[model samples]
Target chain A: IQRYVRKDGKTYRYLTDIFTTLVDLKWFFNLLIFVMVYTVTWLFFGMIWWLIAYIRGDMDHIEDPSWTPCVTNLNGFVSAFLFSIETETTIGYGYRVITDKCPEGIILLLIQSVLGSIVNAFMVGCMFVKISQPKKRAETLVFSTHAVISMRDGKLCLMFRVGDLRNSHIVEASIRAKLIKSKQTSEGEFIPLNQTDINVGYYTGDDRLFLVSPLIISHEINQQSPFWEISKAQLPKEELEIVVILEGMVEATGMTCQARSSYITSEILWGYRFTPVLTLEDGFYEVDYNSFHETYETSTPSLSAKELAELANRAES
Target chain B: IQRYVRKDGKCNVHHGNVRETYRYLTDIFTTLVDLKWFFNLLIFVMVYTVTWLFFGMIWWLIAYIRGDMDHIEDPSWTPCVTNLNGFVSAFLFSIETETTIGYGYRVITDKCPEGIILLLIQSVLGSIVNAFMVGCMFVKISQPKKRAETLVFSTHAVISMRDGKLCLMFRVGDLRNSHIVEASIRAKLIKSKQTSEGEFIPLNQTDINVGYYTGDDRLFLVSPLIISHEINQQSPFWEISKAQLPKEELEIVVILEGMVEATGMTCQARSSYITSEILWGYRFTPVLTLEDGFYEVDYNSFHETYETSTPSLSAKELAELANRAES
Candidate 1:
C-alpha cells in the first residue's frame, strides 16, 4: 500500500519507494536551491540593461533597433545595470528608454522584454505556489514580545496577547513570552545574567488573551556600548509604527506579522482596544534584559519641528 | 484631503472627478488592457508548450530545447508571425531531484543540467507547497483554487483516508433504505419530500450539523459528463476516473473523507455497532449494484487474508492494486 502511483500508468517500484520516503522532508529544499541559483545567474545578464537606464536617469533616452549595431560604451553598461534592478523590482523610476537615435537598442530591448517576463513569472510563480501550500498555515500559538514593565518589586513583568480570528476549530491554545537580557562586565565582555522565571498562559476564549509574567531582569545592555546603546534619549512626539514578527507553529511553522501603530491608542474602535501594561517615559520604552540585548531595537524617537521639516525637505530632495 | 502623502512627502492629487473623468478612465483601461495582454501572452506560451508536449509526447525531449531556442534566437527580433501560443509554455516534464509525485507521463533521462534544475524546482516545489497548503494548513484565501471554491459555493467532495485510499458515497436506493437507515436521513429526506416536495434537510444538531444542501449533482461528479443521464444505468465507471483527475482543492472540499468509508458494516469491530446511518446495505455483507437495475446482494462475506510480503513486492503490488482499477 505504500508504493507510489504516478499519473502515468507505468509503475516504477524502486523510484516510487525512494520518492515516498523523501517527498515530505527534502523535496522543497531541493526546489528552493535550484530556483535561487538559476534565477540569480539568469538575472545577472538582465541586470546589465537595467543599470544603463538607471544611471542615465532623466538624461538619456533609449533608441529603436536599426540594421547597424548601436554599441553602448562601458558607461552605458553601468547605467543599464541600475535600470535593470529597478525594472526587475517593478520600481519604475523613469530614466532610460529606447529612442529613434541609435535605434539598435531595440535588440537589447527585446532581450530585456523576454528576460523581464521570464524572471518575474518564474520567481513569483514559484514563491506563490510554495507559500500557497496548506502546510505553511500559521500555527495557533502566539509568542509574547519579550518586553517587561516595571512593578513595585525588583521582579520584571512581561505581557503578551494571543488573538484568534477564526471561529470554533481551536479549543485551547498556549502562549509563552519571556524577557532575557545581557550585560557587559568590566572586562568588556558581555554575558547573559541568570535565568528568570518564565510566564505561560493557556487561552480558552476566541478573544485576545493576555498573559502577564513578572520575574528578574535576566540580562542588561551596556549603557555606552555601540551594540546596545540607546540613541536619542527621548521618544518621538509623532505617531510611531511598531511591527512585531513572531515565528510560531499555528497551522504550520510560519511567522505572523502584526503591527501596532501609536495612533492605535487614540483610534480605539468598538469591540477592539489597545492597552499597554507600561507607558513610555521621556520618549523611551523600557524592556526586560533579554530583548534589549538580543534583538535589534529599531526606534523612531521624538523629532523636533525643525528636524521634521528637514526630513520632509530631504525626502523631496 | 483626497490626496495621499507619498514617501517623497508630496501630496499626489486624485486625477478623477466624482462625476467622470475620461483621462482617468483611459488610464485605468490602458493599465488593465496591458496587464490582460501580458497575462494572455504568458498563458498562450504555457498552453503552446503543453500542446507541443501533448503532440510530441516522447519527442518533447528534442522539441522543448528547440522551442526554447526559438524564443532566444531573436532575443532582439520579434518572433515570426505564427501561432502566438507556440512560443510559450514549452518545457519538458519536470525533473525529480529526489522524490516523484508519480507523474509518470513526464518520463526523463539524464539531460540538460539547467533545464533539469528548472523543472525540478517547479514541479517538486509546486507539489510540496500544493500538498502542504492543501493538506495540513488552510490554504491562503488568495489562492486561485480557494477563491473559486468560495465564490462558486460549490464543493467537490472526494473520499481520501490517511493511508491513501479514496472513495465516493451516495444514496443508491432512496426510499428503500429508509427504516433500516439512520433516523437522520429518514426524517431529513421523507419529511422534506412529503411536505415541500424538495430535498431540503433542515437539521441543527451540534454533532451532526448538516446545513449544506447540494441542489445539483454537477458538484459531485467523479467524472465530467456532457449532460446528466436520466437513469443510473447509463453511467460508465471506467470513464469516470479518467474524467475526474485528482485536484488539490478536492482535499479541502472533502474534509472528512475517511468518514465516508467508515459507513461500511465490515469496518465495525466487536462491541462497536454499525449505526443504521452508517450502513450501506440491508444485509451485513457486500452488495454490488448492476447497471440493469438489479442488485446482487450478499449477506455472509468472508474477509480476505494476505501472506507476509517483502517491502518491494508489497509496495509494487499495492500500487498496482490501487491504480489497476484506474487503468
Candidate 2:
C-alpha cells in the first residue's frame, strides 16, 4: 500500500514514514531493540571469530603456543567473544591479540573492524536523533482545557491559562492567539476561514507573556476586538476556534520549542473565572497546583460588552 | 548561604522550601530533555514487575485458600511450572501469562472457574497497560517542534524612513523552502512606569502594527517579511526622539505565529529588541533580486543593514516638516 495520498489521487512511498514510526515507539522499547541489535551483531561476529580459530589448527610456530586453537573450550570461546567486542569497538586491551600464524584470523579481524565501525556510527546517530528530539519539551508545556470569559476590572474579557509543568523556565516566551471563523466571501467562493488576532491585554496593547507562573492571557472585549461582534447568546451558535500558539527557547538545550492548543466554541465557558492558584501563607507565597484547573462562575452581567454599551447609549438618549 | 532571599533579609530557610525543591526535581521527568533512555526503561520494567508480582500473589492466595495446591511428582521448575512453592510457581505463571510467553505446561484447569476468570482479567489489564504505554510514548515524540528551528528573526530592529514617513521595522524569515500557512505577525512596545504614589509598575504595554503587504493580516512568509510600524501621532514613539531612546527603558517584542503548511500544526517564533538593539537611520539591504524570469533572495544579506540619510527629527518635528511640505 502507498504511504501517502496526494490531492490528485496519486500515491507515493515515503521511506521516512517508517523511520518516524520506529522513532515514535515507546522509548523503553526502542532502547531495548537498539541494545538487542548491537548485542546480536557483536555475538554474530564473535561466533565467526570462534569458527576461524577452530578451523585453523594449533600453531606451534609462535612464542606463545598456548593461545593457539582459541576455541578449545567454553572458557576459550568466552575469551574470543570478549576479544571480538574489544576489536570491534577499536579498544584493543592487548590481552587477546590475533597472532600472525593464523592469516584467517587477521583477515576476519580486519573485516569485523570495518563492519563494526559502520554499525557503531549508524547506531550512535540514531540514538543522538532520539535524544535531541524537541517533542518531550513541548509535552511539559500545557494549555488550560477550557477558555473562560469573565469581567476583569469591570470590562468583559476572554481568558485562558498556559502553564509549564517543569520548574525550569522557557526563556523569552511569547504567546499569540487568533479567533478563526468560517466566512463566505462576496465572490461566492468560501475562504477556509478568517483569522482575527484576539489581542491579550489589548487596552495596554501587549501580548507578551512572562511564564514564571501559570499565565492567564486575557483579551478585553473592546471595539477593536473580534469578540465585540460576538454576543453572549450568539456565542454558542458560532462555530469559532481560538488557536493559541506559544514559542520559547528550552533553557536546558537552547532549542526552540513551540506549543499550540485550540479551544472550540463549546470549550469556552462564559461568565466563568479561574480560581487563584497562588496564595500567601505564613508570609511566604505558595502555589497550589490542585486548583490550577479549577474555576468559578463570576457575577458578570449576562449581556455582552457590546450589548451593555448599546443599552447604556439608549438610556442616555 | 540562603538560596532564596526573604523580604526581611533574614537567613533562615523553611522546611517547606526543601519540599518544593524536591518536587521541582521530580517534575523534570515530564520534560523532554531531562528524561534519559535508561530512566524510562527502568520505570517500564519496574511497573511491569510490580503488576506481575501483585497478580501472582493474588493467584497464590486463591490457590491456598481453596486448598488447590496439589504437588505433582517429578515437577520441573521453569516459566511454565515450578516445584519450589505454590507462590513461586504462581509468580512464574503470572510473568509468562502477562508477557504472553506461556509454555502450556502450567495450565488453569476447569476445576477452578475463579482461576480462569482471573486469567481473563489479567489478559485484559495487560493489553490496556501496553496500549497506554505505547500511546504516551508516541505523543511525547510526535510533536512538531523541529519546524521552529527554521524560523528566523533579524538580529536588530531599525528605525528608518518608509514612503517618506518614520517607521520602526524588523525582518523575519523562514529558512525552510516550505512556507508557513496563514502566518501572522504582531509587535508590542513594553516600557517601565512609576506612579506618583510610589508604586513601581513593571511593564506598560502598547500594540504596534507590523506592516502587512497585502490587505489581509495574514502573510505568505515565502520570502523575507519586513514588519514595519509607522511612527504616527498615536504611536508610542511619537513623543520620543532617537537620541532619547538609549536612556529610555523600553522593549520591542515581535511575535510571528503560523501553521505548518504540511502538518497543519501551529508554530510560533518570538524575538525582542531592547532599546540598545535598535539602530537609528539604518535601512535594511534589499534581499530580493530578479534573475531572468525568477526572483531570488540572498539570505546572507538578510541581516545586513545600510546607512540611510534619514533626519534625526522627533515625531513633533516630523509632523511640522510634513505640514510645511503640504503648505
Candidate 3:
C-alpha cells in the first residue's frame, strides 16, 4: 500500500512475488529416485507372491485330485519381478497368474494393480517434469532507453544491456544484427525475408551495444527504399506491415542489441516501435543510457569518468 | 555478516537477484466481467469437470445396463462428441466415454482391452484436468536474460534497470533467444563468461534497480558446440568433476510484453546472444547520448544555422555496425 525510495531516484513497484531457484530441481530428482525405490520394493513382494503360488502348485489344475503332486522349486523371485514390471505398466498379459481361484488371488492381483498404478503415475510425472524443466538456451540482451537514439546518417542506432541470468552455469554467447528486406515475387507473390547475408555486428564486449543498419532497401514491407526504384508510398498496406514488422524487430533487437527469442509480428500493434528516454509521470524525461547508446551515437559528458565507471558495474559480457 | 560502505559510498554487503517479467494472454482477458464473474467460475468447476463427467456418466450407465440387453434404446452422445475435432477440445471424449464402464454402445471388442484399463484409471482419478489444462500449452515464450548490451539492442531499445543494474529487452516482451555453434567430439567442456544472459530487473515505484541476462548454459551437454574442444586446452591438474545433463525447455518470456508466444531452440535460448562488458558491481557501464553540433573541416568549433533532428532509436544494422566498430 505504501512505498519507499531506494538509492536510485526512480520509483518502483513489486512485479513478482514468487522466487523460483534452481534448488527446486532436487525435488524432481528425488521423485525419480523414489519411483525406482518403490519399483524395487514392489518387485520384491511380487516375487514372493509368485513363489507362494509356485510352492502350492498351479491353482487352475488343483481341482484334479489325481494331478501329479510333485516337489516343485518355486521361481517366485523371477515371476514376481516380471509381474511387477507388468503391473507398473498396467500391461496384463493374463498368462502369468498367481492363482485362478476366487478371492485370495483376486485380492493379490488388485493390490499389485494399485501399487503398479501409483508407481506408473509417479514415473510419468517425473518424466514430464524432466521434459519441461527450464534449461539455459540463448541469452538475451535488452536495449536501454538512453541507447535508443536517432543517427545523423539517415539511419537509426540503439544500445542494449545484457547479462547471464543463470546460477552456477556458464556459456559463450555471440550476437549479430542485420538488415533484412521484404519483397514480392516476380508473379507479385509476397516473399518472406529468407536470406541472412547481411552483416550486423562484430563480436566484442562494448562492441555489441551499438548497431547501425540502414532503412533504405530495394524493397520494404511498406514502400520502396530511397535507394531503390520504388518508394514506400507505392506499396500496399499488407506489404507495408511486413516492412513494419521487420523494422520493429530490427529496431527493438537490432538497435538495442536485445537478442529476442523470436521475430516481432504485427499481431499486437500494426506499426509499434519501442524508444529510449522514457517519460516519467512526474513530468521529467529520464535518459535511458543503454537504449540511447544503442542508437546512432552514445556519449556522456555530464558524468565524470568515476561516475561512468561506477555506473558500469557488473561488466561481464 | 558485518557490512561496510565502500569508498564509492555504496554498501558492500549486498545481494542481487534477477528474473524475467512476462505478461500472458490470459492476463489480458482474465478481467472480463462476464467471463471472470460467471463463465470462468463455472468453467473452473462445473463445465471444467462436472458437465463432461455427468454426460459421460449418463452415457456410461446406458451402455453398462445394455451390455447384454437390448441395444436399441441406447443414445450415442459419445460418438457425436468424438466426431467434432479440435486438438485441445478432442480429449474430452477420452475423459468421458473411456470410463463409461459399458463402452458407450459404440462397438467394442477384446482387441482394445487397453481402453477398459484406461477408463478404469480415469474413473479412479475421478476427473480429467488435461483438457482444461491445455490452455497452458499455448502459453509459450521462455523469457531469459542476456548481457546488458544485448538487452539494450534486443528489447526494442528499452533499457531495463534492476537493483541499480541496467539491461534491455527486444520485441518489447517477445521472449526468445537462440544460438548455433559447432563443437568437438572428444572431451567434455564448460564455458563460463562474465556476462548477463537471461535475467530480470527489480522495480521500486517507477524506478528499476537491477537488470541483465544471467542465464547459464551447459554447452558440454549440447555436444555440437565446441565446448569439449575449448575445455581440453585449459585442462590442468585434475579431471573435471562432472557434466550437467541436458535441459528440457528454457524459459524465455519477458515481463512487460503481453505474452505473444515465440518459438525457441531445442535448448530454448531463443535468438539472442550474450556478451560481457565492463561492470560496476553487478550493473553495466551507464549508456549515454551524443550531442548534436557542427564543426569545421579542421575539427574547429563553429556556429551554423541547422535544425537538429532526432534519429531512429531502434536500428539493427546501425547498432550492429556501431557495436563492431566501437568496442
Candidate 4:
C-alpha cells in the first residue's frame, strides 16, 4: 500500500496530482465522467436561463401557458426551462421569443448566446482531446511480457519483441530503452543511477521502424553494453528495470502516440529464446499472435558472455 | 525537403506521420487557447449518449423479464398505454431511475422480489458509473497543459565563450504572470554513435547541468533562466566545431519539470534541439531589468540573440589556446 504523507515547510501546496490520478483511473470511470459532466453543465445553464425568464414575469405570452396564477404554480418554471433550452441551443421554434418589452430579456439573450457558445466550445474541445488521447493508440502497440537472454549467431544477446496489433502500420516508429536504477551520490544525494540507451536492430541500419509485424529488438552483450557485467546467474538478483518506450504516429488519426513498459530483473528469462511470431502462409504472411509472449529453453551455457569468451581464449592458448 | 510521398508497392498506406504532423501543427498554433471548444463538446455528447443507451437497454431488459409491470385496464400484453408498448415504458422507467427522476406513474411494486433486486442492482451500478464519470471529467478539465503552455525555450542553443571557457547555452522563460514553484531543470545530450565493432547505437545519453550562479539544481523560474554546459574534456561537444555542427546528427533534449504553484500538479515541459538548430558565437540579449526597485522582465527580447566577439573555435582548439596562453 502507498501512502502520501506531506512534509511541512514545502513552498508549494498539494492541491491535486491530476495526471497521476488520471493515469490510475479505470476506463469505466472515465466513461462515466464523460456523460455526467455534460448533463450537469446543460442543466446548470438551463436553470440560469429559467431564472432570467422568471424575473421578467411574462409566462402567459407563450401558447398553453402553465402559469395563470390559479392552475399550475411551479409548472411556469418548466415552461421557462423549455424556452431557455431553445434559445441556448439556437433551436428556436418561434413560440417563446424574447419580446422587446423587457430590457433584461434582450440583455439575457445576448449573455446566454455568448455563454452558450463558450460552454459549447469548451465541452467540445474536452471531448475531442479525450477521444483522441494517445492512450488508446498505445494499446495497439504491444511489448513482450518478458525479456530473454539468449545467443544470436553464437554471441550472447539480450532480446525483446514488440508487435503492432493493428493491421496498418505506425509511421516513423522509433524505440528507446533505458536501464533505470536508484543510486546515491558521494554526498548522499539521490540520483537516477544511469539512463543508458539500448540500440535496437543495430545491424539492420534503421531504428525508425515500419512496424507491420512483430520485430525482435536485440542488444549485444558487448563491452560498451550495460549487460556486460551481469552474469546469467546474477541477473535475477539485480534490482534494476529496463524501461522501454515506443513512439510513433498513428496512420489513421495522425496523432503522435507513445507506449511505455518496464521489465524488471525477475521478468528477464535466462537461457531462453523467443518463438517466432511471423509465418509465411499461402501466398501471404500471417502473424501468429498466440506465440507472441511464448519462449523456449535454449542449450546456451549459464555464463556471462565475457566469461565465456575468457574461457574460450584460455582453451585456445 | 522532407516529403511524405507514398511510394507504390508498400505494404501499408501512408495516411500521414503523426509526429511530423504534430510538429507542423505546433509550429502553426503555439497556444491551446487558439483551439475551438465546440469540437470537444460534440464528441462528449456522442460518447455519453452511446453509453447511456447501452446501459439503458440492459435495465429495460431486466424490467421486461420481471413480468409484473401493472397494466392500465387490459391484462393482454401491453404494460403502459396501448400505443406506448412494454419496451418503451421499460426504457422510460430506466431513464427515470438512472437519472434519479422517478415519477410515480411507472414503477416497480413490492409484490415482485426480482423487480426489487434488479432495481437495487441498477442503482448501485449507476452510482459507481457516476463516480467514475465525475473523475474523468475533473481530470480532463484540470489537465496541466495550460501550465506547460507558458514555458518558452530559446530559439537556438548557442555555443559561445563563457568565463574564458567554451560552453553551450540555452535560454528558458515563463510567459505567464504566475511563477512555477520548486522548479528544477534537467538537460541531456542524446547522440547516435557507432561502436568499434561496427554496430550503430541509437543513443548515447549524457547529463549536462546548466546551473551557473547558485551551483544547485533548483531554479526560481519567475524570471528567465540561462542554462549553460561547459565544453570540457568529458563533454560530447568537445571534438565538434561550429562548422561541423550543421553536419553532425546530434540532439539536445531539455526537460523542465516542476510543480505548478496553484494546482500543485507536476507539469513537465520538454523541448529538443538538433545540431542544425544550434547557433555558434551568439549570446542572448538581457531581458531582465530593475525598475522602481523591482525586477522586471521584457519578453519581447525573449528569443533575441546577438553576435558576440568570441572566436568560433572547437573545444580542443580552445583548450590548446588556453594552455598556450598560460605557458
Q: List, residue by residue over A1-317, the lDDT tens digit for candidate 4.
A: 10001110000111134335454663567546644554455456557666765664445543455433211222354444544544555544343445545566567678878986776566556645654354444556789999998776557888888877764645236677889877676998988676777666433323545454576677778777778777877887778989998874443323467888989989999988787775544555456789889998867778787888787789899
Per-residue error at A265 for model 4, in Å?
9.9
Question: What is the clash tally of candidate 3?
Answer: 183
Question: On lDDT, who's better, 2 or 4?
Answer: 2
- Tens digit of per-residue lDDT, candidate 1, span B1-327: 221324422232333245456755785587447534665446445644554344334234444445334664555533211112222322322222122332333332222334334343443344334344232223222322110110111111111222342222322111111111111110011000111212111111011112222323212211111111111121111122312323111111111100011122110000001112221111111233345633332312221111222122222344567679878
Q: Better model by TM-score, 2 or 3?
A: 2
In candidate 4, stretches whose alpha carbon ends up further than 4 angstroms from where it belongs are A1-317, B1-86, B141-147, B176-178, B202-205, B211-215, B290-296, B324-327
Share of the reference A-B contacts seen in candidate 1: 0.02
Using Cα atoms, each model's DockQ against the true complex is: 0.01, 0.04, 0.02, 0.04
- Residue B8's C-alpha lDDT in candidate 3? 25
What's the true lDDT of residue B229 in model 1? 14
TM-score of chain A of each: 0.25, 0.63, 0.32, 0.71
Off by over 4 Å in 3: A1-118, A121-127, A130-317, B1-55, B58-65, B68-327
lDDT of 4 by residue, B206-307 (tens): 556455235455776656777777777766788988788888867666666687764466565657777767888888788877677455557766746567
lDDT per residue (tens digit) for residues B170-279 in model 2 = 77788754446458877666665543433233434566755432434477665677767888877779888878978885876666668875446667676767777787
The parts of candidate 2 lying over 4 Å away from their true place are A1-317, B1-36, B66-88, B141-147, B178-182, B195-199, B211-216, B262-264, B294-296, B301-303, B324-327
Give the interface RMSD of each candidate.
24.1, 20.0, 16.5, 18.0
